[model samples]
Target: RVLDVEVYSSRSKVYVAVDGTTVLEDEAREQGRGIHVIVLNQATGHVMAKRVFDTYSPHEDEAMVLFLNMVAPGRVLICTVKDEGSFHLKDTAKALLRSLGSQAGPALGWRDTWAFVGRKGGPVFGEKHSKSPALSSWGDPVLLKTDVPLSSA
Candidate 1:
């Protein structure tokens, strides 16, 4: 089985897909206004969760941290930023993302477009960001082949 993950971010939206299936997209689910995340099981390439945190609100940053904390080690995280993700994002959330191998988390600025994919305990699959004056960014796609069967349902 092959797992393909792609993340894209722009001034107006964010999109994430697994094996070409849309897992999160700004057009639906109020996703493009904040930090969006998708968690996947590395072994089976099955999606575990999809969440969006409006870090522009102070409390949402804490919520984002708590959500990230519950993701077990060895899982995969695919993330992207939309309109303005860092306005009220706290250091705690940034630190947690860094632990997941995110280089864009710490330096993310207001209105910057950022995309990242990484495993909880190890390697960073991809990272990309575009500061102000740029309208979008795309993370290098992550492709993994496994002998284990992937769940389509």
Candidate 2:
């Protein structure tokens, strides 16, 4: 008697939104396998919120999407689908990206942002958490008044 077994695996990227004030010092597990978020109140050193996500399984993308929706509501998701079937690895990846984003959009926020600065620049006003009333209400924020210049180029 012979046995038939097949093995499969994939890689993915995770995204999170954190503000420096209430929700700060966001991070993930070793090899970027999971999320361990901690939010602290600076004034009184109180623990505002803490989240832990363990996603090192087949449905890692779904886990990530679920976490995003849990933390950030009304967040818009970006998906990319292709016209081909499972030939190249990218096709499958694109399909997964499309599916994951679709599953998350209705449950999460729509607004998104990305900002990166060199280590020398430290942490600038990088991004926003959410645009929907539900998530944004968690942290009522005002227009950043710092001297950090905004660039349009």
Candidate 3:
């Protein structure tokens, strides 16, 4: 018996928004098949939000989009650029940029960020170990504060 395999390059980008405002966004292709993300306490430095996505998988992009919409609310999110020069960039100084979508650059600065709420935030889990109000109040956000390396030309 043979199995069917879906092969996607595992390309992705991280977009961050804070309280209906886009603070960061960075799209990156699957490097060795994975993703990079950053998390801040708004009062402290960066820390581990989740394990590194170290393998290319199908529907990775859609999965990422879902992640952005569920996490990152009333907080900051950062995305790390693995292959910078390979792509151009977009302007990310305005909150309006997010209305454009993931393909629209002005993404995350350098290291991408995912403002995980609830359980991901560590200790003091909110409401039965669920992802906090980040989603309930803001409906998740995936915003880029920089540009797509491909758009930098």
Sorted on lDDT, best first, the list reads 1, 3, 2
lDDT of 3 by residue, 119-141 (tens): 12222111100111332231123
* Ordering by TM-score: 1, 3, 2
lDDT of each: 0.74, 0.26, 0.30
- Give the alpha carbon lDDT tens digit for every residue of 13-34 in model 2: 2332322332222222344333
In TM-score terms, candidate 2 sits at 0.23
Kindly indicate the candidate among 1 and 3 with the higher lDDT.
Answer: 1
C-alpha root-mean-square deviation, candidate 2 = 19.2
Q: Which candidate ranks first by TM-score, i.e. highest?
A: 1
The list of candidate 2 runs beyond 4 A from truth reads 1-32, 38-48, 54-56, 72-124, 127-153
lDDT of 1 by residue, 30-118 (tens): 54578888889977777899998888777998998888888887788777887778888888888887777788787778777788877
**If both were scored by TM-score, which would come out higher, candidate 1 or candidate 2?**
1
lDDT, candidate 1, residue 126?
77
Off by over 4 Å in 1: 28-31, 134-153
User: Which whole-number lDDT from 0 to 100 does residue 103 have in model 2?
Assistant: 30
Clashes of 3: 39
Candidate 2 clash pair list:
73-109, 74-108, 74-109, 74-110, 75-108, 75-109, 75-110, 76-109, 76-110
